[PDB]
């Protein structure tokens, strides 16, 4: 059997009518599916444990995930090898702690709420991969390191130092966070993982057989930033927000890396350095998107590849053939590298 524990937030205030309507329908449908567990609600927060056959649990959770009556749904625990139920006589008992006034309940209710609020804070500072791993039924702390082929993605804001020199601190942070949000949304949708931000740089990766998705993600980012630039208000710093992007491919180490008290689930390897070094060359090469021949050859779609140069850095003493893709979007984005050389006056005036 499978047992799923999640928490969620009310999308909007819910009356007593609606709360017991949820319990009513949930209990009837879980009875049919031989699913048991408990649904708790407290100050506009839901907690639910559900247990039963994995296929039935997944289909129920799928409906729960689509229910517009709550949001911020976060699976805290997925157990996929359960052989004894924890709540057998209870298709879906519902408990409302708001209407509860019992003696020892008052301190436990406060603790539940404070734990949940603290957990919601830490979620905002936690890599998305950690919650994905948890939702697959794995404790991330017990993942052992492995060598894995990845496509590594590195991007940054062109002429970012001009933004920091010219704009108030709150506007600098607004620009960087807008950029990070654009990149993160598209990378994640294309099946990649944003693993680190450093300064105004994004580091991300894709499965090693997903060069096509990494390339498409990169082109979509350039496309989204074009929409952002040309839709921004007159005088907005967003009108001169341009990105450089570099991709590389290689065997890296994936796992928990860090100090005793603080680690990241992330990657380590030469392809990280290569992606960052390629991304740095975007200005010299006058191309917003650059990538290695290994990425080029790994792709299976008929992209309009253009050879740029044979270049070296390192280290390992081997030259690297560097490519881009030639289309209207990359030409426009590459012209943006030139525009961004002289945005100081424009930014001085926001």
Do residues 45 and 9 touch, judged by C-beta distance below 8 A? Answer: yes
The interface with its own copies within residues 82-111 (CB under 8 A) comprises: 86-87, 93, 95, 97, 100, 102, 104-105, 107-108, 110-111
Helix axes 16-33, 54-66, angle to 10 degrees: 160
Least Å distance between CB 222 and ligand FMN? 38
**Distance between CA atoms of residues 58 and 95, nearest Å:** 23
The interface with its own copies within residues 40-69 (CB under 8 A) comprises: 40, 47, 49
The interface with its own copies within residues 316-335 (CB under 8 A) comprises: 316
Q: How far apart are the two ends of the chain, measured CA to CA in Å?
A: 59
Least Å distance between CB 29 and ligand FMN? 3
Tokens describing residue 260:
């005793």
* Site for ligand FMN contains 60 (CB under 6 A): yes
* Site for ligand FMN contains 69 (CB under 6 A): yes
Residue selected from 117, 312, 338, 348 as contacting its own copies according to rule CB under 8 A: 117
User: What are residue 263's DSSP bridge partners?
Assistant: 258
Least Å distance between CB 1 and ligand FMN? 15
The interface with its own copies within residues 207-246 (CB under 8 A) comprises: none
Long-range pairs, 99-105, Cβ under 8 A, ≥24:
99/16
Least Å distance between CB 130 and ligand FMN? 23
* Site for ligand FMN contains 298 (CB under 6 A): no
Residue selected from 4, 7, 49, 50 as contacting ligand FMN according to rule CB under 6 A: 50
Q: Which range in 8-16, 165-173, 289-297, 335-343 contacts its own copies by CB under 8 A?
A: 165-173
Residue selected from 67, 98, 165, 338 as contacting ligand FMN according to rule CB under 6 A: 67
Q: How many CB atoms lie within 10 A of CB 1?
A: 18
Least Å distance between CB 133 and ligand FMN? 24
**Is 60 or 151 the residue whose CB approaches ligand FMN more closely?**
60
- Residue 87 interaction partner, one of ligand FMN, its own copies, none, beta carbon < 5-8 Å per kind: its own copies
Half-sphere exposure in the Cβ direction for 48 (13 Å, CA): 28
> Could you give the string, one character per residue 279-318, with x where binding to its own copies holds by CB under 8 A and - elsewhere?
------------------------------------xx--
Q: Which range in 26-34, 133-141, 282-290, 302-310 contacts ligand FMN by CB under 6 A?
A: 26-34
* Site for its own copies contains 5 (CB under 8 A): yes
Q: Which range in 45-53, 233-241, 277-285, 340-348 contacts ligand FMN by CB under 6 A?
A: 45-53
Q: Which residues lie closer than 8 Å to 43 by C-beta, 6 or more apart?
A: 97, 98, 113
**Distance between CA atoms of residues 218 and 231, nearest Å:** 20
**Is 109 or 296 the residue whose CB approaches its own copies more closely?**
109
Strands 201-207 and 146-157: antiparallel
- Residue 112 interaction partner, one of ligand FMN, its own copies, none, beta carbon < 5-8 Å per kind: its own copies
* Site for its own copies contains 173 (CB under 8 A): yes
Do residues 289 and 245 touch, judged by C-beta distance below 8 A? Answer: yes
C-alpha distances in angstroms, 94 versus 13, 38, 41? 18, 6, 8
∠ CA(224), CA(229), CA(231), 5° rounding? 90
Long-range pairs, 209-212, Cβ under 8 A, ≥24:
209/149, 209/298, 210/151, 211/151, 211/247, 211/249, 211/295, 211/296, 211/298, 211/299, 211/300, 212/299, 212/300, 212/301
Strands 289-292 and 243-258: parallel
Least Å distance between CB 92 and ligand FMN? 5
What are the residues binding ligand FMN (CB under 6 A)?
A: 8, 22, 25-26, 29-30, 39, 46, 48, 50, 60, 63-64, 67, 69-70, 92
């Amino acid at each position: 059997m499978k047992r799923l524990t999640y928490i969620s937030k009310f999308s909007r205030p819910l009356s007593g009518d609606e709360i017991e309507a949820i319990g009513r329908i949930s209990s009837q449908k879980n009875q049919q599916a031989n699913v048991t567990g408990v649904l708790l609600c407290l100050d506009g927060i839901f907690f639910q444990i559900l247990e039963g056959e994995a296929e039935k649990i997944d289909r129920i959770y799928e409906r729960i995930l689509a229910d517009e009556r709550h949001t911020d749904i976060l699976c805290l625990k997925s157990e996929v090898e359960v052989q004894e139920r924890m709540f057998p006589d209870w298709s879906m008992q519902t408990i409302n702690l708001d209407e509860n006034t019992d003696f020892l309940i008052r301190p436990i209710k406060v603790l539940l709420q404070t734990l949940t609020e603290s957990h919601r804070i830490l979620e905002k500072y936690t890599q998305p991969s950690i919650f994905k791993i948890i939702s697959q039924g794995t404790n991330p702390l017990n993942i052992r390191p492995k060598a894995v082929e990845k496509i590594v993605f590195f991007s940054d804001i062109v002429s970012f130092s001009t933004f920091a020199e010219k704009l108030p601190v709150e506007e600098v942070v607004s620009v960087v966070n807008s950029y990070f949000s654009v990149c993160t949304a598209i990378i994640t949708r294309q099946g990649g993982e944003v693993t680190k931000f450093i300064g105004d740089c994004v580091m991300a990766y894709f499965d090693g057989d997903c060069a096509d998705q990494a390339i498409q993600a990169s082109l979509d980012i350039l496309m989204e930033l074009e929409i952002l630039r040309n839709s921004a208000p007159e005088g907005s710093p967003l009108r001169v927000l341009y990105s450089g992007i570099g991709l590389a491919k290689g065997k890296v180490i994936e796992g928990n890396i860090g100090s005793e008290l603080k680690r990241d689930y992330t990657i380590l390897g030469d392809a990280v350095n290569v992606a960052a070094r390629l991304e740095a060359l975007t200005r010299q090469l006058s191309q917003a998107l650059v990538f290695s021949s290994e990425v080029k050859n790994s792709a299976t779609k008929s992209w309009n590849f253009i050879w740029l140069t044979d270049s070296e850095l390192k280290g390992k003493s081997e030259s690297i053939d560097i490519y881009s893709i030639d289309n209207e979007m990359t030409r426009k984005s590459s012209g943006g590298l030139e525009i961004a050389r002289n945005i100081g006056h424009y930014l001085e005036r926001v």
